[PDB]
């Protein structure tokens, strides 16, 4: 352990793309716990010289969610011995905090749009699209993409830009439109129709783009906390094997920052057909 | 520095529900060995070197070579 | 290794090499091309009040034998590639030149005193074997050590310090005898007859002790040439073996020196003989 | 140092011939192994904990005891390396001699054997400045029956076995036999970090 020195750590041009995708969504944030909805839809009578039917519906919806960043165990155990010997590990920990913060925004987006995690559960974009059944089967065509965009605008609110999953954007660029114009070609910035498309990495999502406009995004604050006393053991090796984490200061700092997101159902998405 | 030195670091993602702080960070190091040496002049430049000492025009050609 | 070094290592035994250079001194040191002529004796006696007579004696020494230094084989070839690529190895090679310079004085002193591997004829052991024997290493006795001092008194020779190897000193320190006289040991150095002497590292037998009288020392300098010639006679093992043609590259620095020792009239040396 | 530092290069040099020039090269390096450890006191420290909290004099005495324990920390590491082999480090003093080659024996005691031990060291070519000896071993080494005595000193400052001054240190060792130290590297980080 800690034999050869590398003196190198990975930094920037990876976490910046994930942070830009979360900012592109745009959502209102509130400091107070819970939410409230507005009263909608009221019955009206058409008959002459009569009171008729008269009923008004009232709606109220509260939203509250708590989020916490997970601390490292396997990689953190090796880093503890390096921190005492080298000063570069302390500077690397500050850069790792920014990567963990970028992963925190990435996990919140993957649970809703891609349905990978159970952070949002109820208010999810992928779950709402499956219930409404607006998704198109098979490969997405150039003419089919314009028809799908027009169908969403007629039923619900029109979306500015569709979400890209890296691999899906490359397949869309190869396809050409019927008219004398380049389809999904980026000269300086990539755009589906007008507004700039956001790229996000997802494990569950691979093919198909989902377009969403109205989406709520709220955050408690910044993810930063001091590390003290060892908790939650998974893998540790230095001199003797241990089942439960005890003794000395904590190997990795666990960050806490609450995040809540509410869905208004606007996403449609696309899924490939299998035979 | 002699040879080549490269360092890479990877961070692990933390759990949604708050219970225990997960650590474990991945580290990778890359190094390359053996450097290529430049070839020295042989009989080709040796014939021109004798002309360079006698003629003024051939002396400038040796510097250009 | 294949011509690779991460960190430079410090050389072992520095004080032992420096001590051997200072130990080789008996009859002054002066810079000369060959051997300088000795001082005139000229015997003088009072005798009678009226009569006046004085004896005259002339002494001269002829120039013979010169010092030679050879470049290192096999080990120097491995160091040649390291010095060209790394800056630390190049600085270490310059420090090694100073260490080899101390070894040059140690090699010349050991050959003249023991085994007779020197260019000079009739010195210490070679002078005693050719002229007359004083001591024997074959037989060891406490009474014989006292008898050796009595033989020196009849020969009329003055000695300041006796040169002895590290292996011979260990055997000379412990000896079984009924009565002990003149040993010192605890103060600075162990004495055989009753005089202080410094020990130098030399290839010699453990049994027997040698004494030095008067010998002239000559020195020209250390390390003149830095560039090394093509190897053919020297054996190479590292990287590539050389026998005929070799590439022009510096591996070991060449040193220029001149040394000539004056022949002594009386010297004590011990030779081992089988029973 | 954090670990063990690499040793200095030897590089053998000899004059030989006037024209010929040859020089030997030797490289030495030491790998990092073994680390020092300090443990908290049991039973006795628990009784002192209640006294230090209530009385001001006991709290000041505990701070003075930390300096006394720091001196004991160096004493415990030196005794384990020299005798009984209770140290983390492999191949040191007694452990190094038992693994490689034996020089002296504590089982047999003789005046002629003590002189014979010095002759064996001369053939091995090893330089020693001071020989480490326990208080119990020093009492037995001081008085010995012999026909002829050479190099002992005693009256000046310290008793010598071969003919060199040496300081005695308290260590758990047998009374019979004597041990000699040559060359050993020392490493230290500090004393008392956590209160």
Numbering used by the authors:
A (entry chain D), C (entry chain A): 35 to 309
B (entry chain B): 66 to 130
D (entry chain A): 66 to 260
Lines from the paper:
80α is a typical example of a staphylococcal transducing phage, capable of transferring non-specific chromosomal or plasmid DNA at low frequency. The capsids are assembled from a major capsid protein (CP) as empty precursor procapsids into which the DNA is packaged through the portal by the phage terminase.
The structure of the DNA-filled SaPI1 mature capsid was determined to 8.4 Å resolution using AUTO3DEM from 6471 particles picked from these images. CP subunits A–D derived from the 80α CPFA model were placed into the SaPI1 density by rigid body fitting, followed by real-space refinement in Coot. Density for the N-arm was apparent, demonstrating that the extended conformation seen in the CPFA capsid was not due to the lack of CP cleavage. The distribution of CP subunits within hexamers, however, is dramatically different in the 80α and SaPI1 capsids. In the SaPI1 capsid, CP subunits on opposite sides of the hexamer are >11 Å further apart than in 80α, leaving a larger hole in the middle of the hexamer, and the hexamer has a distinct bend of ≈10° relative to 80α. These differences presumably reflect the different environments of the hexamers in the T = 7 and T = 4 capsids. In the T = 7 80α capsids, the hexamers are located on the flat face of the icosahedron, whereas in the T = 4 SaPI1 capsids, they sit on the twofold axis at the edges between faces. In the T = 4 SaPI1 shell, there is no rippling of hexamers around the threefold axis, and the dihedral angles α and β are identical to those observed in the procapsid.
